[PDB]
Amino acid sequence: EKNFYITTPIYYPSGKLHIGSAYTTIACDVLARYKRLMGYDVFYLTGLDEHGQKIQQKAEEAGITPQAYVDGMAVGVKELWQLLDISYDKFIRTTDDYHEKVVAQVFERLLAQDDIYLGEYSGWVFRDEAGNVTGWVSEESYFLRLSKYQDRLVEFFKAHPEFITPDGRLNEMLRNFIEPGLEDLAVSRTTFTWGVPVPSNPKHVVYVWIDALLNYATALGYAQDEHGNFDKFWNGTVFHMVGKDILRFHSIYWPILLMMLDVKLPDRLIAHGWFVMKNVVYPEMLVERYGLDPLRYYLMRNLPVGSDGTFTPEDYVGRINYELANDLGNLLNRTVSMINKYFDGQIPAYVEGVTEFDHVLAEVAEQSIADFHTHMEAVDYPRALEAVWTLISRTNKYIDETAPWVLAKDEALRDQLASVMSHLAASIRVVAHLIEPFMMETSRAVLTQLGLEEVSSLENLSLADFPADVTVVAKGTPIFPRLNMEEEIAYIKEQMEG
Ligand SMILES: CSCC[C@H](N)C(=O)NS(=O)(=O)OC[C@H]1O[C@@H](n2cnc3c(N)ncnc32)[C@H](O)[C@@H]1O
């Protein structure tokens, strides 16, 4: 159906990536996976921002060309995205030929339109003896005419109040940068060579941010021979996920660029806060030890919308223990044991309102599914997952309330025992569906133990809509590890310090 395009920032390859950059790439992966499962036609881009002064310095310290240096880095990044199961449809690098060409043409085009002019870069109280300020950047530089599109950008902001999420960040951009008056922007540099040369004046390289921002267009084939993906996906729904500290580049410079090139503006910028480790933690270490799905769950659940989030060893191990192993794992494990013991693995047909608590569980499942969808559309994963774990929580309660082991010792309550059992399986099926974007492997294994096929859609989900003639596995396997909580905390702290 409808077209949906989601992008990460293209990260600087200036080191080995920590949780920080993993966070955003996993977050966009979750959204892409979800949108696909909701029957959208989806494109998901990530990649690397390879030009710049610092990168060139690194390469010379290493004793190799810039190209070979960034080639070194790109291999490591692709390896990490492989580890974290990132389902990007394309990976873009700014040293890719097709990209560098388009950047050159765009710059030239803008110059021909007088949207870029040639002026003098200048600016920065101590004075000399003639009142001149001593304590100075000074070069020739091209300037982008942001001032000329200020009114038009203000209109855009006012007509699209949900252009940036969460609420408040759009007003911050207005107050701090736009309403006071946009200055024209220096979009070239001359103090280094590692960049896209301005054709008409090769001593200037394009400012890395203009070069970088265009990645979102060029990856689709903008201003190239094969441009089907641009016409499709750029004219559909376009989301850019970014960290708050690069919001001005994406909310001011990028929209105005797109105005000058006469193409559609994106529909949403999702700006998020910082992940802080409490002091560096590498994805591989965590994935090797406890697996991928814990990491993805942890990162997505622990960065709240509108604020920063914090990692601790205690919280990481605690959530695996309580939220995954106990809340979800034991629920599955004991659901499967009881279906075996009482109905020889055959899950009874689903009949609504057999016990007193049935209608209550059903109303909670409907609420959890609706809340999940609301929060996923807003890209609020903590709240999305909270809704999932509300259903888990109420399903564990439902076991306590119906007391299957009491029902089983009375032959007149067989229909009730059966309804408990079908309601447990049905509940866990819904849960395995809701978590799939976050925890693909966990989802599959949960469903396998219930004798169900892996998820294929998230449309039209409900508790009652359960397949007939289902048989659970004869023997259950734990989906999560049983941790030595003190040892694992001490292990994580050891890896961080050492
Ligand atoms: C056209 S987009 C150009 C982006 C630019 N190259 C850049 O900026 N690169 S970066 O390597 O600095 O990556 C910054 C982004 O990585 C993510 N990031 C890095 N560290 C963290 C962190 N600790 N918590 C959350 N996100 C983080 C956010 O998405 C930031 O916006």
From Swiss-Prot:
Subcellular location: Cytoplasm
GO biological process per UniProt: methionyl-tRNA aminoacylation
The organism's place on the tree of life at top rank: Bacteria
EC number: 6.1.1.10
One GO term describing the cellular component: cytoplasm
Main location: cytoplasm
Motif extent ('HIGH' region): 11-21
Alphabetized GO MF terms: ATP binding; methionine-tRNA ligase activity; tRNA binding
Keyword Transferase recorded: no
Catalytic activity: tRNA(Met) + L-methionine + ATP = L-methionyl-tRNA(Met) + AMP + diphosphate
Subunit structure: Homodimer.
Family: Belongs to the class-I aminoacyl-tRNA synthetase family. MetG type 2B subfamily.
Name of this protein: Methionine--tRNA ligase
Gene label: metG
Range covered out of full length: 3 to 535 of 665
